Amino acid sequence: DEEEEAKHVLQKLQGLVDRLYCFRDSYFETHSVEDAGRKQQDVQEEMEKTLQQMEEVLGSAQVEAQALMLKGKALNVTPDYSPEAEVLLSKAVKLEPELVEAWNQLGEVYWKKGDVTSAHTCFSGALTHCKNKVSLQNLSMVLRQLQTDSGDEHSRHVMDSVRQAKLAVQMDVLDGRSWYILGNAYLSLYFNTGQNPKISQQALSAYAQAEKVDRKASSNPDLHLNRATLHKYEESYGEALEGFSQAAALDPAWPEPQQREQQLLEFLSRLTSLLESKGKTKPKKLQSMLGSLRPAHLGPYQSAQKMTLELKPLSTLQPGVNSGTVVLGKVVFSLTTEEKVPFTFGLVDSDGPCYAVMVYNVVQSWGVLIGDSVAIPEPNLRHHQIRHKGKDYSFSSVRVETPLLLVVNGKPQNSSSQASAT
C-alpha cells in the first residue's frame, strides 16, 4: 500500500507542476496581448497556489528525489533565481544522479543565478545520462554565452551552439522553442564570422519556422527582439522597429526592446535631419568643399583582378550594387551609434541631395571626418521609406560591407580598420 500511495502522490505532484507550466507556456492562448503586463504576476500567484497544493499532497510524508525535483521545478517557473529550488534540486541529483530533469532544472536555476559555468556543467552532465531535447536546448543557449579570454574558443562555442541546437531541433521538429534556439545560434554565428548573409537567412528562416510550427513561438518576446536586431543590422528598419515594438508589447516591463526602438528612432531622426540639412552646411561652404575634390581622390581597383571604374554621380546610381562604377564625394557629417557599428556619414558629390553611407565591420576608432574625400567602388544603394507609429523617415543610403572597400583622401584603408580578420 505504501508503494501505490507514494506513486499516487508523485502523479498528483507531477500533474500540479505540469499544469503550472502549461499555465505559463500557454498564457497567450487564453489571454490577449493587452493582458501581457499581468503575465508575470499571474504566473507568480499560480506558482504559489501550486506549491500550496503540493504541500497539502505531501503532508509530512518523506520527500523522494522526484518530489524534490518537482517542487524545485515549480519554484523555477518564474524568471527569478530561487535559492530554494537550488537546494531542492541539488538534493534530488544526489538521491537520483540519473534524473535528467533534475539536472536540467538545476542548470536553469544556476543560469538564473548568473552561474553560467555551473549551468553548463548541469546540462553537459545530463547529457552523459540520456540524450534529451531540453539539455540540448539549454546547452545551445549556454554555449553562445560562455565568457572566454580567447577569440578562437568563443568561435568554437558559437559553432557548437549551432550543432547542439540542430540536434535539439531534430529530436522534435514541431517544437518552436528549438527553432527559436537555433535561430539564436545562427544569429551568433552570423555576427561571429563576418556576417555572411546566408547565415542571417538561416537565422531568419529558423525563427519563421518556429512561428510556423508552434503558435506559442509568436508570443516569445526574445524571438521578436532577436529577429529585429538582425533586421536592424541588415537595414530592414521598418521590420526592426515593428519587431522591437512587438517584443515590447509581449513584455511591457522589459526595458530593452523599448530602449532599442527609441535608439533606432533617434538614429533615424538625426540621420534624416542631417541629410536634409547637409550637415547644416551653407551653399557657400558646400561649393568650397566640392571644389576641393580632385582626380587622385579616386585612388585605387581590384575585385579580390584589375578593374577600371567609371566615376558617376550618386543621383545616377540604381538600387543594389552598381557594377563598373565608383562615386566620389565629400563628407558633410558623421553619426555614431551606441553599438559602434555601422559608422555612418553623409556624402555629397553635387548640389543634389546628400546620401548616407553606413560602413559595417569597422573597429571603434575608425572613421572619416567632415571635409574628407571618400570614394566608394561599386556602391550598394538602397532607398529607405519607413513608416512607424505615424512617423515617416525617407532617405537613400550606400551600404559598405567593410572599410577596406573605401578610399579616403585618395588612400586605401589599412586592414586594421576591419573588425574581423582578412
What's the residue count for the chain? 422
Given in angstroms, what resolution was this structure solved at? Answer: 2.0
CA dist 10 and 3 (Å) reads 11
Q: Which of 309, 326, 316, 303 is nearest to 379 (CA)?
A: 326
CA dihedral 405, 407, 412, 414 (to 10 degrees): -60
Q: Provide the angle, in degrees to the nearest 10, between the axes of the packed helices 100-113 and 116-127.
A: 170
Give the amino acid at 383: H
CA dist 312 and 199 (Å) reads 33
CA dist 208 and 199 (Å) reads 14
Q: What are phi and psi of 332, to 5 degrees?
A: -100, -15
CA dist 127 and 144 (Å) reads 18
Q: Residue-wise over 54-79: b if at least 16 C-beta within 10 A, else e?
A: beebeeeeebebbbbbbbbbbbbbbe
| DSSP assignments along 4-73, one per residue | HHHHHHHHHHHHHHHHHHHHHHTHHHHS-GGGGGGHHHHHHHHHHHHHHHHHHHHTT----HHHHHHHHH
State which H helix or E strand residue 328 sits in. Answer: strand 325-335
Tell me the H-state helices in 214-254. Answer: 221-233, 237-250
CA dist 418 and 411 (Å) reads 15
CA dist 330 and 372 (Å) reads 6
Give the single-character DSSP code of 306.
B
Q: What method did the depositors use to determine the structure?
A: X-ray
Q: Which of 368, 378, 357 is nearest to 409 (CA)?
A: 368
Q: For residue 114, give the 3-state DSSP assignment.
A: coil
* Cβ proximity of 72 and 90 under 8 Å: no
User: Count H helices, E strands: the chain?
Assistant: 15, 10
CA dist 232 and 240 (Å) reads 5
- Residues whose CB falls within 8 Å of the CB of residue 407, separated by 6 or more in sequence, listed in order: 297, 298, 299, 300, 374, 375, 376, 377, 413
Sign of dihedral through CA atoms 189, 190, 193, 196?
positive
Give the position of cell 526602438: 261
Pairing of strands 320-321, 380-388: antiparallel
* Cβ proximity of 293 and 327 under 8 Å: no
Fold that domain 1-279 belongs to in CATH: 1.25.40
CATH 1.25.40.10 in the chain, residue ranges: 1-279
CA dist 161 and 137 (Å) reads 9
CATH 2.40.50.550 in the chain, residue ranges: 280-422
CA dist 364 and 343 (Å) reads 9
Pairing of strands 407-408, 373-377: antiparallel
Give the single-character DSSP code of 362.
B
> Does a cis peptide bond (omega within 30 degrees of 0) precede residue 403?
no
3-state secondary structure 29-48: HHCCHHHHHHHHHHHHHHHH
Q: Can you list the positions of beta strands (E) in 136-219?
A: none
Q: Which of 399, 384, 396, 35 is nearest to 240 (CA)?
A: 384
Q: Please state which CATH class domain 280-422 belongs to.
A: mainly beta
* Cβ proximity of 200 and 235 under 8 Å: no
